Amino acid sequence: MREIVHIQAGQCGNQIGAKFWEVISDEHGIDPTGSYHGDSDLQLERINVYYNEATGNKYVPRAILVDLEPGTMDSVRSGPFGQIFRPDNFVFGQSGAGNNWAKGHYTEGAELVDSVLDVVRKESESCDCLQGFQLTHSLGGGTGSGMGTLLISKIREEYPDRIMNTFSVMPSPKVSDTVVEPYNATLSVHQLVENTDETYCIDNEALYDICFRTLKLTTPTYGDLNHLVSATMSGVTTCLRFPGQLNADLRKLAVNMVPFPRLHFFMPGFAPLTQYRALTVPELTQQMFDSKNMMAACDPRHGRYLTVAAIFRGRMSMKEVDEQMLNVQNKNSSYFVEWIPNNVKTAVCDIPPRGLKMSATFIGNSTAIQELFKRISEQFTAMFRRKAFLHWYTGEGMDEMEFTEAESNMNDLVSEYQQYQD
Amino acid sequence: MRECISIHVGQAGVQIGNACWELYCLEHGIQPDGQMPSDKTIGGGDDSFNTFFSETGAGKHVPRAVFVDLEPTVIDEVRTGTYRQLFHPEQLITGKEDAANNYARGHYTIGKEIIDLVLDRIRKLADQCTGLQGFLVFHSFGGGTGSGFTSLLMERLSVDYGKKSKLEFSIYPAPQVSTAVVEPYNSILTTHTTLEHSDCAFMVDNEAIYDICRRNLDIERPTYTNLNRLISQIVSSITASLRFDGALNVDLTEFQTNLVPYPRIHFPLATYAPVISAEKAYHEQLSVAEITNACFEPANQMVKCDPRHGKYMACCLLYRGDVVPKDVNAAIATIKTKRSIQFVDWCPTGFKVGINYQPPTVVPGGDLAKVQRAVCMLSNTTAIAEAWARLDHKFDLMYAKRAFVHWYVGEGMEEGEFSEAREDMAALEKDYEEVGV
Amino acid sequence: MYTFVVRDENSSVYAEVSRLLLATGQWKRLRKDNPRFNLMLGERNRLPFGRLGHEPGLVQLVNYYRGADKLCRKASLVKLIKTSPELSESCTWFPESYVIYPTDEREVFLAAYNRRREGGNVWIAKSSEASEHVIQKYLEKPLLLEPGHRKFDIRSWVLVDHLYNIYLYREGVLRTSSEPYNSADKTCHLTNHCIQKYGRYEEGNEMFFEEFNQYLMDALNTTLENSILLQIKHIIRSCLMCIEPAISTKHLHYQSFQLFGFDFMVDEELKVWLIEVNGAPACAQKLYAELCQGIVDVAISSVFPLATSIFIKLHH
Amino acid sequence: MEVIELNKCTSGQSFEVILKPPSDPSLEEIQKKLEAAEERRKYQEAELLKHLAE
Ligand SMILES: Nc1nc2c(ncn2[C@@H]2O[C@H](COP(=O)(O)OP(=O)(O)OP(=O)(O)O)[C@@H](O)[C@H]2O)c(=O)[nH]1
């Protein structure tokens, strides 16, 4: 359990994946040219987890960039760290997916998938001991949603004994591109229930609310939302990238956070929300667990936590961290399940993210996540009961029955979370 | 002269293994290069310390040990540690992919692929013995390797060395020093599979070692190094008789004869004192009576429980340092009147005592202060069943919903093994209640 | 706030303690099976002590002393007094008792009964001729309240906190009878509120302390403190200091407190006799409020603080 | 309070203090269970590959 292979598909997938590499390259002291100019050695001890080393002491990320149109991947190759990526790992087409799950999954996407698998196989074959894969994408479009899930299905067929992890962005009418987004998201969730071990649910509705109400941004942009997404992504990989007592990896994560195979959709949280006055430990814990700090638009007070994991970064008191975590558990013990003893894990890392003197990141497996699937389910049924906009999909070879199935499995998932909440 | 072989499995087993062998070399005057200037029989001998060390023609004293782990991070510390020159590469065994805190993954999936390699490395040590006693096995309950692979190794050792004794040193799981939510599952599965193959096992609860390091050593956040150097002191006093001249517990079979009347109830409770902080430039040196009295204080034992509400079956007192029998008997007579020490009516109400004149050894610059006398008590009491009930209840909470069970099934295990191992733990709990009334 | 759980719905005393704690605003009740709690109001039988004091960061307190049933079981109380050198059987305040089975003491009970039968003696048994569990001598010469020519028993409530301080409630209750004593029917022989139900002399057939102390002054020229209470305080001290090394939680990973109900018997020579020790007692209606609040003040909030006394501290 | 079996030497001594008198599976069976678990794993993997095949 050492090397991770990263993959990013579609517009959203390649934009948050780009900011992710820009952030962690900075934390490990890797410049845009792949050279190391850091001061400590903690940034080089586990660097092979995400970076390959080339002759000449250069560090090249182990990432693969995928898209059915070249618009977004051109901007990445021209960005701040565009020169850092291996040139061969750019795989893209020209037709695009038109925000249509069927095009990404069945027609346009099928032509390109084999080329992606060739690059994945090339990276995997060079791994001393491959952990698994992580994928970034949105569920409301065509490429990341439709083709992204097709890739997951194929990768599981060749590497069935490796972990599959995703960062999945949920659509919201408050930040919408097309009216068919509920269709695409319902079809992708069905796939995710079957073929991933861990999924971080990044809700665009929650990101918007945080920028508007807390950060006081009247007209938020995708750039603003991705600032929150990159902070969250850096926080939830800290324990994978730095040497610590934990020594975490993707399998131990899944083993300890997922009590039932289907219920592997996690709710992430971060604090503080982005000035020179560092926060006290009690401030971190309080903010980290507040609804205003959740990245999925669900109220944790409407459900219970199956498992929780939290990391603290900076130079702080471990005693004070323990004293504050045990405090929140024992003062909100009504929102934790009783039948999983010691289901809250805490860890500390001495390296704080750039700019902050200390921060805290939260991973939650809560039954309140059902409010998200309910939201998407109601939007789905309002259109489907009149067969509205279906011709876009029946023209790609799909039948109505396939929609009835994804909707049916989506509602089963909602009732499954309600089962374990009572 | 009869040899003993030690086996260290998983992270906990290997790290604790390093601590012990570091202390051994200090107590026997063996430098980190294997040289022993006090030994005058170069290349051989049948001395007491040769039960744990063999000798080469150049004068090196090599431990009779083997280190095993399904991943290599922890054993690489040994190969580059202060005592690297002590071991031979064939004695250290490492895999690629650990058991992911999964018993089934360590016993079935990955255990089958490496069991023969380890048995062949063990066979190489046995061949160099003329009169092998048995094995000492270190491991954890909670880890996927320490629980799953250990139980496979103990099954095979019984087959290849049917007449040899096997002792365990096991680390019982605690949330204060936690690593996985399924540690109750792995604890029950391995206790069920190892039981018929272990002659005597010493449990150490990480909650107890954690509280002692905080209370007595004034250490706010204890580390593995702190925990192990205190655990090494306990181990060194339990194995001192095998390495030094003496008459009490001079071979592995004596441990069963003096501590284990019933085969299944083979978990003696250990208690140690005094643990004094080395940060105190001076501390009153406790007497024989005082340190003996502390062996019946719950805050000093390796497994938190109330011996006042159980019955004893056997008791052994092991002293090290400036101790003479006269004082030991005075303290014993004193403790029988102050406290409640009730044996079972079918066992004698006595104590077996051993005294080693060499006082305890401490790591230079470590956390433990040098003392002039110390004692470790080994008592087989029913009160230790409290720890079985605590652990069995946590297993029942998760299993009622079948939570996490799919990770084990996916490795080839059947749900039936869960209830099978659980019913065995219910029978074990019942056997303690019959003895304790 | 502070955390407590409830595991005995039949507790009249702690039903008020759990209700008074809810009136504090600083205590909140959990589900009966939640492991993370500061205080447990646990069940009578098979309370799982072995699972207490193992939750990190939690100071856990419980309303029972493990091993305290040796004093509250009639068979084990007899054994405790006979085999305890601190009591040594020779204690002058416990009636001659013997334990039998349907080791046994059937042989030694009939031996002392022979020296007794020759002369008189009448015994009692629960769980005049011997031919017709534990057996002890029946106090054939009790103290009778006039008018009425009736017997009674005294109930005293004692509270022991985590530090093993012994607090004696200032308010007692005499559970009196209604029918004159006939040393020839068993209603005038057994003093119980349920058996009595009646209520002609006092309400509920229970006389409180201020009235009984006035009766002792006008009828006997003495006070309740000198004639009876001193002896009661001695018995309470002697019994609780005996088992202290066996149940004390002074160095244990969890802490204990427990309310006790001592039942005494007074004879016509103003001598106090201990009948039995109750581990799960009830209380009088006119005293449910004062006592239960005293518990929280001295026993609960003494470990879990917030933002004259009613007990007499029996030093030792 | 009796002491018995006092054994002295240069490294120490030992004795006993009494206060009151008193009132396996074969190699093939192992391999059998190990190979059974590997078969159940192989079965479960064949069903997934058959599911992905559809
Ligand atoms: N006292 C002590 N306990 C330890 C030590 N290392 C791990 N533990 C305990 O062991 C348990 C975890 O099992 P490990 O030994 O780390 O796991 P493993 O045997 O390596 O098996 P894997 O799951 O494959 O890693 C936890 O309960 C830890 O508290 C140690 O060095 N000293």
Ligand SMILES: Nc1ncnc2c1ncn2[C@@H]1O[C@H](COP(=O)(O)OP(=O)(O)CP(=O)(O)O)[C@@H](O)[C@H]1O
């Ligand atoms: N040796 C004795 N001499 C005089 N009276 C006795 C006696 N033994 C029992 N009694 C009477 O019997 C009554 C109840 O006896 P006992 O207390 O053993 O039953 P019990 O425990 O079920 C009710 P409680 O809980 O109030 O003690 C007492 O009120 C007492 O007056």
Ligand SMILES: COc1cc2c(cc1OS(N)(=O)=O)CCN(Cc1cc(Br)c(OC)c(OC)c1)C2
């Ligand atoms: C749900 O509980 C448990 C959770 C976990 C473990 C054990 C548990 O069980 S436990 N309490 O040890 O008994 C071990 C593996 N670990 C991985 C991890 C990844 C990340 Br990222 C983190 O950062 C947010 C983190 O937190 C700092 C931890 C999760």
Ligand SMILES: Nc1nc2c(ncn2[C@@H]2O[C@H](COP(=O)(O)OP(=O)(O)O)[C@@H](O)[C@H]2O)c(=O)[nH]1
């Ligand atoms: N948070 C975030 N969401 C995005 C971004 N770009 C697109 N989205 C969302 O993703 C969905 C559209 O999918 P998109 O990635 O554009 O389609 P694709 O290119 O076919 O994969 C809509 O719900 C958008 O709100 C982005 O940069 N950040």
Ligand SMILES: [Ca+2]
């Ligand atoms: Ca020699």
Ligand SMILES: [Mg+2]
């Ligand atoms: Mg788009």
Ligand SMILES: [Mg+2]
């Ligand atoms: Mg390990």
Ligand SMILES: [Mg+2]
């Ligand atoms: Mg009663």
